[PDB]
């Protein structure tokens, strides 16, 4: 209801972004 849904989709958002970071790094070290 409150930050329940709003704060969740936030971690999830940041999670995804954190994966893309992972990828950029591993290309950039080839």
């Amino acid at each position: 209801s409150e930050k329940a849904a709003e704060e969740a989709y936030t971690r999830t958002t940041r999670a995804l972004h954190e994966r893309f970071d992972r990828l950029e790094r591993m290309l950039d070290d080839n």
Partner: antibody, heavy 122, light 108 residues
Framework: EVQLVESGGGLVQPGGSLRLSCAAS????????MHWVRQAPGKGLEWVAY????????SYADSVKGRFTISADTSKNTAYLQMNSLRAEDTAVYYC???????????????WGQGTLVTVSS | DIQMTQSPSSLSASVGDRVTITCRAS??????VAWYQQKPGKAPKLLIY???SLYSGVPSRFSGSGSGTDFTLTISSLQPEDFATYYC?????????FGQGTKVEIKR
């Protein structure tokens, strides 16, 4: 005129709240992105936070997360740093810098404000 | 979690001298590095991004190198207005990190 001006810096008791702003001009803050970095008296540079308004992306340094909140208002083309629970060690000059790209990792911090001082004692 | 070890802490040099400041990233940060210049009471000024890409307007004397995880900022010749302190930065991780600073002073 592409400039960065920062204000709202002042004196606050420990545990108090302050709330800074960084007025943006000569570019669209929303099309791009920003950082608050800070500098304890007599010490080095320290990353505080970042935001890509149009990615609705925000990120933080551990030494906060849960006391500071960074925001944007497209209307005023302005960035905010809301600091609650301020300590003496949060004492420091706080700067803005733009980052020309829309994500923190594709560009460095090109333009910077003059920095406003935040002293915190009891 | 990524430390940037800067070296040296301080350094004396003369006008015309070629100076080198180094930065050891504690783990690959792969090219995502910048160097800043800061004068007392003034904002930092961006010199090199991408571990060695000249920022527009910056004097071509300034230069950046990178060798795996060691980064060098070179100044081919050293003019008056270049006395300052310089910081490397990594921005390869969402926790951006700055080195502790090198003071570049006038050797008299």
């Amino acid at each position: 005129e592409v400039q960065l001006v920062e204000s709202g810096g002042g004196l606050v008791q420990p545990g108090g709240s302050l709330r800074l702003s960084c007025a943006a001009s000569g570019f669209n803050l929303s099309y791009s992105s920003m950082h608050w970095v800070r500098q304890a008296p007599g010490k080095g540079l320290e990353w505080v936070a970042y935001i890509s308004p149009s990615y609705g992306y925000t990120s933080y340094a551990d030494s906060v997360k849960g006391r500071f909140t960074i925001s944007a208002d497209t209307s005023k083309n302005t960035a905010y740093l809301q600091m609650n629970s301020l300590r003496a060690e949060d004492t420091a000059v706080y700067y803005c810098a733009r980052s020309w790209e829309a994500y923190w990792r594709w560009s460095a911090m090109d333009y910077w404000g003059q920095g406003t001082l935040v002293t915190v004692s009891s | 979690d990524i430390q940037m070890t800067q070296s040296p802490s301080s350094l004396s040099a003369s006008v015309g001298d070629r100076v080198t400041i180094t930065c050891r990233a504690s783990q690959s940060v792969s090219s995502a590095v910048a160097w800043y210049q800061q004068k007392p009471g003034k904002a930092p000024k961006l010199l090199i991004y991408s571990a060695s890409s000249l920022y527009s307007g910056v004097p071509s004397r300034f230069s950046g190198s990178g060798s795996g995880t060691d980064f060098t900022l070179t100044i081919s010749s050293l003019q008056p207005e270049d006395f300052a302190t310089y910081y490397c930065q990594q921005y390869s991780y969402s926790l951006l990190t700055f080195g502790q600073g090198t003071k570049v002073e006038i050797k008299r």
